[model samples]
Target: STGSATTTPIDSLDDAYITPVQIGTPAQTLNLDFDTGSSDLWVFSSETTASEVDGQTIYTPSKSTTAKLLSGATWSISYGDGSSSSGDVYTDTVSVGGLTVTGQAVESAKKVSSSFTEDSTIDGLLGLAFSTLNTVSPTQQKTFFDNAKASLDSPVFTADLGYHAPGTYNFGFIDTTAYTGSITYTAVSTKQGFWEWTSTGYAVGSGTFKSTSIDGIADTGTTLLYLPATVVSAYWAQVSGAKSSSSVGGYVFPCSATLPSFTFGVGSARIVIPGDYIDFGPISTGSSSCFGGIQSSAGIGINIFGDVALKAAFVVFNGATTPTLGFASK
Candidate 1:
């Protein structure tokens, strides 16, 4: 059967979407950042350095009768933003919504970078990417979704993210009511252990749609939308007084400017991100210049369709032997 989980943004920036997950025998509920861009169900655990533990909750594996140490297993995972966590592993019963996996590998962090130490909101991350990306060494482990796929009605999950609001994640079934019209699906490539797909082209505001294909991934863990410099530069060109700033390290425009909307094509489907969404936030509190969410992925190696774009549409991550990503307007 299918299951659903409610996910909420952590802050005004909508930096991350967190979902309540139950782990262990007695069921310690933790708010975990369910990320689709990576694979590794890691947590700030009892083993994590005390210095790294801020206001976040830590999972005490010893407290759970079902928790079993995965002997000699070590894991270290890093992110695109450079933050990281590493530690040993444990297998325990973990549940998301009503979907439970009995032997889910739970990475217990022994160390974490400063960024994670300062952030008090998220207790850990529940990776939803392909199992090939799992960080567990010698013996790689399957993700929560991968472990639950066999029992699920369908081997798929859907993301419905909202801007500064609550959203839903449905496993095994797509909530047809959550989106408008038919879904447009594209074949996904796991070459880099990501849900990589190609967009037909992009259109800036009311302009014509260019037929240039761009390869990117539907990354829920990332905060910004990154595209080719050619597309990013073209979009910002329409806004007056917009320029790539050295200080902020991205394109920034006058806060008061009438920004244009961004539209990307998935086959024949067009997902439109509103102008206000593009104005990510002020460079500084109350600053006159705002950072553009759509930035150039020139140095990133892979372009990303992060929350900035995902929040504007309904996305389905289908985990069949031959995976496919389905998109629809909400």
Candidate 2:
């Protein structure tokens, strides 16, 4: 059986992200972002000055007898969105659903600034994107999934990211209720520690494509699907009265109309996003306009399958079973 030891492709890791579950004592509940891209689970602390902590929830370690710090090492992280935070590393007992894992590594940011700090809705992002992105690797290292894999009934976890609005974010067990039948999985290819591959094309409303003849990769770390210029322009054409607005950064229209149904083709599978998934709520940049799932990209090399795309399907990251990523509707 030594030679039979299965090897999962590196690409499949891209489908994984840490789901940062919110934990609290009577006095405090910390909102956290679970990022697999980086090893540490970080949260704002009460020690953080109020000016430095805007919309983020800061936890008081003294309130929890279970809180423990590791040799007092300082940690800081800078994100792509021009935000940064620095703090000390700590270990605490954290729980998700009914699952509890003790000695979980977490980062306590004394200072934080980024879109992550400003969002009042979901306190933090749980990055389940990949293990290679772990900051605690080689030393004092363990990923959320790496630790949970042994105890979870299934070594797999599926994320049902909600559509335009806040959709259901599921964890631990796999829900097979959404599938039409069997799952169609594709092998993963590892690139820079991320599971990546190109799509055949993207389509919405019947067999007609919104974007034709484009090669793009799938990523979960990003929050929205980014399409190329030609595809972006072509997709808007299909929308009867839709138009792009510079105020909100993408396509916007009135919510009073019935929207189109869309799908994306990956290998042999055709993933669908219902019209409801496309109906996004209004964001306050200025005017009260609404947004849809599909958005314009200024010509990037890759496409991300963020919350919008993930919410419509049941995504399976199989590291223990097969060397492929299984996709189906939940």
Candidate 3:
């Protein structure tokens, strides 16, 4: 509910609408990247010439036996890590979770970075953030959400980032069994790709709320959640001898002991940040660095709860399924 704009309503049924697009030449089923940090769903193609694509999966339209490319526009994307990929844009009959959207524009990158080249995770990312952040030019194509908005039961869309096990990012509509409470709806503001919001404060173990006035965006593209220095310092106080280490580049503390639990608040809804994520790195020479689920970002304008925190609980993004976000365990 941050950024700029008036809020609108969408049908709840839209949650089930999945747009299927072609990923590469020949063609492969491409799902939308539900990322708020960036807007683009790019896949590697057979025509790609980049070395970064050595071991990556390239979607082929011919193999699908039911897929096709939309058109001739090409596509490419770069990440904050300096890694990037390039491909052509094509629309085709694509599927997600279960729903399907026809004639969707998908990018088939010919050049890919080494990081993406070796990973066997899903073929590509699904951007569920904002339509404005989409790399596709409005003159050429519409976002998966924008194109399928009319079909969605609601004008909104959602992402249930429930990674039941390691090395997975589930896409499409979320099943109800993933959470405990009813969906919580919030209006989205249009702006830069980031999803920004202000927090009332934070709490620990149902304790009184501690006010730490700050605002930042929630991005799925990042792997770790970042926080302002002031808030981070206050929160880290809960850990004994909390301090930043040179090797880590961020905050670090002794992990021999069990750490306290904390929760981040948006209005009144609190998303608990797990301890294991916080103390995740090495413990000794043969050990690894202790990495906490939450990390200090100092003046960073964004607080990203990357897959680390997301995997710990069920996070539902209901974009017009009356558009409610629900978080649950398992």
Q: Which stretches of candidate 3 lie over 4 Å from their true place?
A: 1-34, 62-72, 137-140, 163-176, 204-207, 283-285, 309-330
Better of 1 and 3 by lDDT: 1
Candidate 3 accuracy as lDDT: 0.54
Output the number of the TM-score-best candidate: 1
Q: C-alpha displacement of 160 in model 1, angstroms?
A: 0.5
Rank by TM-score, descending? 1, 2, 3
Over 1-330, each residue of candidate 3 has an lDDT whose tens digit, in order, gives 111111111111111112333433234554333455666766766666756655545676556544555555666677765777766776665544344567766666777777766653435665666666666643446665656667655454434443322222333444466466654434434445445555557765446778765465556556666776666677677777777675866777775656666676655566676565455555455553454556776545456555545544555554553333444555
* Cα-based lDDT at residue 227, candidate 1: 99
Error of 1 at 288 (Å): 1.3
Instruction: Give the clash count for model 2.
Output: 20
**Candidate 3 least-lDDT 10 residues:** 1-10
Off by over 4 Å in 2: 1-29, 33-40, 136-140, 163-172, 209-221, 241-248, 254-257, 283-289, 299-301, 321-323
lDDT of each model, Cα atoms only?
A: 0.93, 0.57, 0.54
lDDT of 1 by residue, 1-330 (tens): 777999999998888888999999899999999899999999999999998999998999999999999999999988988999999999999999998899999999999999988889999999998999999998999999999999999999999999879999999998989999999999899999999999999999999999989999999999899999999999999999999998899999999898899999999999999987787778999899988989999999999999999999999999998999999998
Q: Write the per-residue lDDT of candidate 2 for residues 1-330, one digit (tens) a residue.
A: 000011111121122233335444432455444432344566767766577666656667777777776774666666544666667766677666556667766667677775545554334444454555555423544555656667777666554554322223334555667456667676655454444555557776775654344443345555556777666666667776678877666888765657676687666677887766666656454545667667766644455555456656767665463334667765
TM-scores for candidates 1 onward, in order: 0.98, 0.77, 0.75
**Preferred candidate (TM-score higher): 2 or 3:** 2
RMSD to the hidden true structure, all candidates: 0.9, 7.1, 7.8
